Amino acid sequence: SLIRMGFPQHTIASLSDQDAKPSFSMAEPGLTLGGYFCPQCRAKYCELPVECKICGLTLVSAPHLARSYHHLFPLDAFQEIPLEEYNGERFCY
Amino acid sequence: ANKELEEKNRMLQEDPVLFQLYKDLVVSQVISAEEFWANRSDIIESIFRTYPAVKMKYAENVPHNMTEKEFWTRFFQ
Amino acid sequence: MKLNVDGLLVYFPYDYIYPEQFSYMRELKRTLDAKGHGVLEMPSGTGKTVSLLALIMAYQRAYPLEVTKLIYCSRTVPEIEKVIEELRKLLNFYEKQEGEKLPFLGLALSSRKNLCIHPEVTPLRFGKDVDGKCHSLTASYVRAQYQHDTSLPHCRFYEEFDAHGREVPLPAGIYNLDDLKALGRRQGWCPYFLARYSILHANVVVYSYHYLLDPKIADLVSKELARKAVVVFDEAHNIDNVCIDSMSVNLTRRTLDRCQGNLETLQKTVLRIKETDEQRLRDEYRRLVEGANPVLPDEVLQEAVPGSIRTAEHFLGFLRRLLEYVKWRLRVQHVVQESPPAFLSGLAQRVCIQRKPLRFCAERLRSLLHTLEITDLADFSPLTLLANFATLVSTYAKGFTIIIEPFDDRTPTIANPILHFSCMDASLAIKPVFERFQSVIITSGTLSPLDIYPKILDFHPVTMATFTMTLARVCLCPMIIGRGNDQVAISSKFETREDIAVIRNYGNLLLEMSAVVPDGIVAFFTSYQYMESTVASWYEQGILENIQRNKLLFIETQDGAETSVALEKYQEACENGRGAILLSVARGKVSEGIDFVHHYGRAVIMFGVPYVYTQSRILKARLEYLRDQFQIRENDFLTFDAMRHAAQCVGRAIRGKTDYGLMVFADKRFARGDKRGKLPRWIQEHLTDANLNLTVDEGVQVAKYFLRQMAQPF
Amino acid sequence: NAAIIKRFNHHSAMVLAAGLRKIALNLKKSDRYYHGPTPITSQDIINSFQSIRQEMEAYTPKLTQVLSSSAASSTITALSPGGALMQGQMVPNDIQSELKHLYVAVGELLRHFWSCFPVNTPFLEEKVVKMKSNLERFQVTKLCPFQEKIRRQYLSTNLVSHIEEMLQTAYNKLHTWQSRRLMKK
Numbered sequence A: 001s002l003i004r005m006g007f008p009q010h011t012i013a014s015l016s017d018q019d020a021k022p023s024f025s026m027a028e029p030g031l032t033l034g035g036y037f038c039p040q041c042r043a044k045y046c047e048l049p050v051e052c053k054i055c056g057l058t059l060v061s062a063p064h065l066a067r068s069y070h071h072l073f074p075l076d077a078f079q080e081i082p083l084e085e086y087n088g089e090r091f092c093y
Numbered sequence B: 001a002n003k004e005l006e007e008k009n010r011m012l013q014e015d016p017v018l019f020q021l022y023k024d025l026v027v028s029q030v031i032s033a034e035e036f037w038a039n040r041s042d043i044i045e046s047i048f049r050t051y052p053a054v055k056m057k058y059a060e061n062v063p064h065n066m067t068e069k070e071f072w073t074r075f076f077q
Numbered sequence C: 001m002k003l004n005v006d007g008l009l010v011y012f013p014y015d016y017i018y019p020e021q022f023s024y025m026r027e028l029k030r031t032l033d034a035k036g037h038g039v040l041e042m043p044s045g046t047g048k049t050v051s052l053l054a055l056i057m058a059y060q061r062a063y064p065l066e067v068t069k070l071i072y073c074s075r076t077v078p079e080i081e082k083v084i085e086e087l088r089k090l091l092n093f094y095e096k097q098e099g100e101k102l103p104f105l106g107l108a109l110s111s112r113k114n115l116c117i118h119p120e121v122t123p124l125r126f127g128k129d130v131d132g133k134c135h136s137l138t139a140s141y142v143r144a145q146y147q148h149d150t151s152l153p154h155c156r157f158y159e160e161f162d163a164h165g166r167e168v169p170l171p172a173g174i175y176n177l178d179d180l181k182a183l184g185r186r187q188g189w190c191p192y193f194l195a196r197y198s199i200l201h202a203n204v205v206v207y208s209y210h211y212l213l214d215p216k217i218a219d220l221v222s223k224e225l226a227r228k229a230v231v232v233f234d235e236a237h238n239i240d241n242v243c244i245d246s247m248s249v250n251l252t253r254r255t256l257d258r259c260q261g262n263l264e265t266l267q268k269t270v271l272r273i274k275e276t277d278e279q280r281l282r283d284e285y286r287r288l289v290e291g292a293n294p295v296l297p298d299e300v301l302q303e304a305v306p307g308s309i310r311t312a313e314h315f316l317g318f319l320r321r322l323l324e325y326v327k328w329r330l331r332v333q334h335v336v337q338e339s340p341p342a343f344l345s346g347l348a349q350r351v352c353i354q355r356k357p358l359r360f361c362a363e364r365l366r367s368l369l370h371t372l373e374i375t376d377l378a379d380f381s382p383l384t385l386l387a388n389f390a391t392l393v394s395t396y397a398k399g400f401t402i403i404i405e406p407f408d409d410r411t412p413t414i415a416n417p418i419l420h421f422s423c424m425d426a427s428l429a430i431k432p433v434f435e436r437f438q439s440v441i442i443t444s445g446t447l448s449p450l451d452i453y454p455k456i457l458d459f460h461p462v463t464m465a466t467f468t469m470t471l472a473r474v475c476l477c478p479m480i481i482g483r484g485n486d487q488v489a490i491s492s493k494f495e496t497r498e499d500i501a502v503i504r505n506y507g508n509l510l511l512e513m514s515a516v517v518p519d520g521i522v523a524f525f526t527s528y529q530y531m532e533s534t535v536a537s538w539y540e541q542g543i544l545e546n547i548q549r550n551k552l553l554f555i556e557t558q559d560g561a562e563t564s565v566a567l568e569k570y571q572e573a574c575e576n577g578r579g580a581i582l583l584s585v586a587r588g589k590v591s592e593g594i595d596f597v598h599h600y601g602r603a604v605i606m607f608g609v610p611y612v613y614t615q616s617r618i619l620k621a622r623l624e625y626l627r628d629q630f631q632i633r634e635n636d637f638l639t640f641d642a643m644r645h646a647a648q649c650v651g652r653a654i655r656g657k658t659d660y661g662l663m664v665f666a667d668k669r670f671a672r673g674d675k676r677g678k679l680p681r682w683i684q685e686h687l688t689d690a691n692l693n694l695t696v697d698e699g700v701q702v703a704k705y706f707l708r709q710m711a712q713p714f
Numbered sequence D: 001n002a003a004i005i006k007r008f009n010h011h012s013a014m015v016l017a018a019g020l021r022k023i024a025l026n027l028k029k030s031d032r033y034y035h036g037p038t039p040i041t042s043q044d045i046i047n048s049f050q051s052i053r054q055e056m057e058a059y060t061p062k063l064t065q066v067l068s069s070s071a072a073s074s075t076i077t078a079l080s081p082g083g084a085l086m087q088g089q090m091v092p093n094d095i096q097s098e099l100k101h102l103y104v105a106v107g108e109l110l111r112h113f114w115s116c117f118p119v120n121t122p123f124l125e126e127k128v129v130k131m132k133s134n135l136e137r138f139q140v141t142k143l144c145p146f147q148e149k150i151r152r153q154y155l156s157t158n159l160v161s162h163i164e165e166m167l168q169t170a171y172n173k174l175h176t177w178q179s180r181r182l183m184k185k
C-alpha cells in the first residue's frame, strides 16, 4: 500500500534571535529558536522523523528514507579466493 | 460504578493543566465540553475467584460483624 | 528410494533414512533367510514399523511362495490404527513406484465393541454388552426368526453380508477400522464378520496380542492355512505377563453369588423348556453322546464325549456340586495356600467330581447354553468363567496353581474371599505360535536383555541384536541421579523409601525439574500408597505448593475416567501457557496405555527402582516357579521385571517424529553395574558417567543445558 | 487423605476450566532510486587536462611564497565575530504558563478537529463530525482572540502569533475543504 507522507524543512531565526518566532516544542517544553514545521499542524518540532501529533501523518527528512534503500539494493556477494591465486595485488584494494 | 464522574477526580490529581483546561474550557465556554468524554485480601479474592464453592459461599455468607481472617480459617481449617 | 538391502533392492518412500534402519532390516532378514524365529530391539516405532513393512513386503513380493501372509501384532488399537495407515502409505508409494495396482490386501481386526455398525448396539459402549447383543443378533435362533420374516430386530448387515458379502470377497487395498466401518456401512455388511472373512483372502492382518494369545480368537485367525506365514510382535516386551494373565482366571465371592443367580436363571429356563418342549433340544444329545469359546489351546482341546454329564439335570447337578465345593473351598477361613493338584484331588475327594467329565464343562455349557436359546451371555458370563476355570483346572495345571485368598486384592482384608488359578509360564501357552508358524519375530523397545526371553519362552533365536538410534544429534538424553543435594543417597531401598529426606529430595528435584522442563513433564511412583504418602508429605511442606505454583499438577488413580479427564486436562494445560505435571504409578494402566510425544511428557521422572511387593502370593508363585522350573534366580527375574517395567514406562518418551525427550532416574541403583547391564543398549550407551551419578542439582543443570542444545534445528 | 489429591486436582481442573471462556523482489525502473530528490566545450576538457599537466611542473614551493600575513589576516578577520564569515528570549514569564495553557488547549482541540478532517468520508456520521468540528472551530475562534488580546495588551512587545497561525490555517483548510466539498457535491 501507498502512504501519504510529509517532508517539512527545518527553519531557524534569521540572525541571533532576530525575526524569530517564539514558540515551544511539541515534544516542560523549552522555547524553540528553530525547528521543523507541518503544512497542516503549523506546530514547530525539534526532532524528526515523527508522526503528526494532530494530522496523524508522518513527517520525515529525505535522507531517512535513503537509509533504508540498502534493503532495496542488496549487495551481491563477492566470490571467495582464499588462496593467493597468483593475484599480483599484494595490497588489498 | 460512577466511573464517568470518577474519571474527573482521577484526572484532578494526575494532571493539573489537563484538568485546568477541562475546567477553563467550560468556565470560559470555549466549546461545548460534554462531547469530551465521547472521544476519551488477595488470599480470599484469589480463592473466591478460583473456586465455585467459595464463590457461592462468600456471596451468601459474606463477612458481617466478623473478621475476614475468620472466613479464611473456615475454609482452610 | 531403492534400498540396497542384503537380500534384494527394497523400494522405500522417504528419500532419506537413518543408518540403523538398514541394519535392522538386513538383520531381521536373517529370520526369513534362516526360516526361523528371533528377537531384536529398536527404539523408534515408526522407523522400525515402516522398515519392517518394506522389508517383509519386498521379501513377500520376492518370495510369495515362501511366505503367504504377514501377521503383525501391536500393543493397542490406537497404535494399530496408525500402523495400518502407515501400511496404506507404503502401499500408496509402492503403487506409485510400480505405476499400477497389484493384487494385495491388508486389514486391521478389532473386537465388536469398536468394529460394529448396528444401530441397536451402537448406543452400547461396554464391550461385553456389544458382544452379547451382537452374538444374540447373529444367533441361529434370531437368524431362523429372521428367515421366518416375522417382526424382528435383526442385523441386516449380517444377513446381507452372509448372502452377498460372503459371495464376493474384497479384491485389494488397505482398510482401516474407521474405513472398514464406513465400507461396511456403504456395503451394508458387518465390518467384524467381513474382516474376519477377509482374513481368508488377505495378505496382511493386524490385531493386538490378545487376538493371538487367547486361543478362542487366535484359533479362528491362526488357522492351519497360515502354516507358512510370518507373525511379528512389534511391542510385546511384556508378552510373558500378557500371556500368563490371559491364561490366569480370578474367582470371587460375588462371582459365585452371580453364578448362583445365573444357575437359578438356568433352572428357570430348563423349567420353561421342559414345560414347552425338551425333545427338540435332545437333538443335541445325539451328537453329544456321539462326540464365546473355551480358552483351551488347539492341542489341549478335544471333541471327546462329555462323560457322565449327558443331561441338563446331570450338568446342572454337576455344576451345583462344583459351585458348592468352590464356594466351600473359597469361603474357608485360612492362610493363603497353593493347591495345584490338591484342589483337583480335593474336588474328587470332597465332592467326588472327576476331572474327566469336568474337562467338558465349558464344552457342555456352550452346547447346553446354545440349545437353551438364552437371551445373551453378558449376564451368564460369571457362570461361563466358572465353567471355563473348571475345565481348565481339570484338564491341566502343570503351568498353573490354585491360590485361595480370604480377601479381595488391593485391600488388606475384606470379607470377600477370592481364588486365583494363577498361570506361571508363557512358553507352554505360547507354544502353538512358534510350533505352527515358520517364523516369529519378537521386536520391542525398552527391551531388557534378550537372553532371559529364551528361558521364559521356548524359542531358538536366529537373531540377537540390540539396535540404538542413529542421528546427527542426541535427541534422547538418559540420566541417573543417585544423590540428593542434601549429600544423602537417593536410593529407594525398602526401608529408606519412606525416609523424609529422600521424599524431600524427590520433591525438590521435581520442583526444580518441573520449573525448568518446558510444557509437559511426567513422574512415575512405585505405588499409590507411597505416592499419596509422598504427596501428603509434600503438602505438609511447601514443596507441593511451590510445585503447583510453578506449574499445574495432576495425579493418576485407578479410575480410568478420572485419569482420562485429568490426562486430557494435563494435555490441554500443556497446549496452553499453563502447562501441567502428571504424577502416576509405574504399574498403573495409564502408564501402559499413554504414549508420550513432544510437549506431552517431554521429560519422564522415575522415582526409585519399581519393585513390586515381594510378599504378594502372585509374585511368590511366579518367582518360585521360574526358579524351580526355568532356574532363574529370584532377585535376577525380580530385577529384570523392575528394569523392564521402568524402561517401558520411561522409554515411551521417544516414539517417533524425531522429537527430543529427557529420561531422569532418581536412584543410584540404576547406576549399579548389573542394573546398567540390564538396561537396554540404546539407553545404556547414551548413559555415561557424567550423567550416571548426578546430584539433583547436576541433573537440573545438565537438563537445562540439554534443552538449550535441543531447541535449535538439526 | 485422598481428598488432598482430589482437591489439588480439582483446583488444577478449575484453574483450567476458568482459563477456558465459554514474494521475490521486483523492479522496472531502478535508476530513479540512484538520484532521489536530487535535480539535474569538449575542447575545454582537453585544454584543462593539458594546461593542468603543465601546471604540475612546479611542486614543493616556499611556504612564505605560498601564503602571506595579509591573506591570512583577511581570513582571521573574516572569521572574527564582526567579520564576513562569522554569523554569531524568556523576557515574559507569566506568559510562559499562559502559553502552555494555550498550547495544551489548542493541541487538545486540534486533535479532535483534525481527527476526521483530511479524509473525505461522504457519509452522514462522518460528515456530521466535520460540521461539528467546524462549529467547534467557530467556538474556539471566539475565546482564542480574547486570550490573544490579553497577551497583546500585557506584552505589547515580542508578539506570539504562532499559536494564532494554527487557528488561521485551520480556517484556510476549513474554507478550502468547505468550498471543495460544495464544489464536488
Ligand code: SF4
Residues within 6 Å of the ligand: C112, C115, C116, C117, C118, C121, C133, C134, C135, C137, C138, C155, C157, C158, C189, C190, C191, C192, C193
Ligand atoms: S452382526 Fe455386524 S453389525 Fe450386527 S452387531 Fe454384529 S458386528 Fe455389529
Ligand SMILES: [Zn+2]
Residues within 6 Å of the ligand: A038, A039, A040, A041, A042, A052, A053, A054, A055, A056, A057
Ligand atoms: Zn500535521
